[PDB]
Amino acid sequence: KQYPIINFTTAGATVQSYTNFIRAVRGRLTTGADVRHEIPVLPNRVGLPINQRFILVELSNHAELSVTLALDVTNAYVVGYRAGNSAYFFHPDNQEDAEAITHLFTDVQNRYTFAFGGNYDRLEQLAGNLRENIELGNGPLEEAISALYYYSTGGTQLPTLARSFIICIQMISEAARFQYIEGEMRTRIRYNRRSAPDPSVITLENSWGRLSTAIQESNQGAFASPIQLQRRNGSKFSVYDVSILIPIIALMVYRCAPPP
Numbered sequence: 001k002q003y004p005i006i007n008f009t010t011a012g013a014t015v016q017s018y019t020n021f022i023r024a025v026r027g028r029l030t031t032g033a034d035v036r037h038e039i040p041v042l043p044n045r046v047g048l049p050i051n052q053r054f055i056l057v058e059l060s061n062h063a064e065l066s067v068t069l070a071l072d073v074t075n076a077y078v079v080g081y082r083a084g085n086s087a088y089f090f091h092p093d094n095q096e097d098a099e100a101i102t103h104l105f106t107d108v109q110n111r112y113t114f115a116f117g118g119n120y121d122r123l124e125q126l127a128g129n130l131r132e133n134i135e136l137g138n139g140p141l142e143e144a145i146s147a148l149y150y151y152s153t154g155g156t157q158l159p160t161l162a163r164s165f166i167i168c169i170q171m172i173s174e175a176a177r178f179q180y181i182e183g184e185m186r187t188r189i190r191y192n193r194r195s196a197p198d199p200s201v202i203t204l205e206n207s208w209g210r211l212s213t214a215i216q217e218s219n220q221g222a223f224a225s226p227i228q229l230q231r232r233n234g235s236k237f238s239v240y241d242v243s244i245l246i247p248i249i250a251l252m253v254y255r256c257a258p259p260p
């Protein structure tokens with residue numbers, strides 16, 4: 001089965017090539033049909049044809065190594081990847097997702113399913129480091145592509161693999177979900193400055209599902225409960241309404257149908 005493929009290379013990467021990549025990814029994740037308070041909602045998992053379930057991100061680096069990440073269109077999240085003759089999948093949450101991933105990389109010679117899921121809690125434990133201690137940028141991405149590629153012949157240990165997934169997920173999935181995080185990566189690429197995400201980034205990533213719920217359930221734009229987020233300096237602030245999120249969040253996971 002063929003899914004839509006978006007290419008990115010770290011080789012001669014610019015602010016514009018990274019931006020064109022992330023815009024292409026958002027374009028393929030959304031039908032455009034569902035928009036709540038100006039923010040697009042990803043397709044509902046329920047009833048979604050398998051032929052429309054995934055998109056593929058092909059990543060190449062200066063070493064001319066390529067890996068293809070599979071993203072689930074329902075949550076923009078990485079479900080697995082291919083490196084040459086091997087494909088690797090996170091442990092699916094449920095039997096429906098276990099069945100869904102049998103449709104990815106169907107021609108690959110070797111298929112592997114990890115015992116662990118792709119959630120940050122587990123990936124941080126395998127990496128031996130939190131996201132706040134893992135640098136992001138074109139350099140970390142170049143390194144993550146090599147690490148993912150060389151897992152296929154065991155040239156990569158599990159902690160380095162896990163760190164590589166944390167880099168890829170943030171620079172692709174989280175950048176697609178948030179204009180703010182795309183902006184943080186664009187600043188790194190423009191000025192050639194690798195750095196770990198600050199608390200403003202980590203708390204947005206943490207809150208994505210909760211912000212998606214809060215916006216979609218909202219009393220015509222206003223939240224039932226205040227979501228707590230962090231400033232760059234790590235101080236906590238409360239978000240009561242959708243207006244402050246429209247500049248920040250690009251995509252939401254489907255929670256419920258639009259209100260009456």
Ligand SMILES: Cc1cc(C)c(-c2ccc(C(=O)O)s2)c(C)c1
Pocket residue numbers: 180200201204229230231232233239244245248
């Ligand atoms: C929803 C939302 C709204 C705003 C204003 C932000 C910040 C943008 C710059 C910040 C800083 O300089 O500390 S904080 C975030 C991270 C999320």
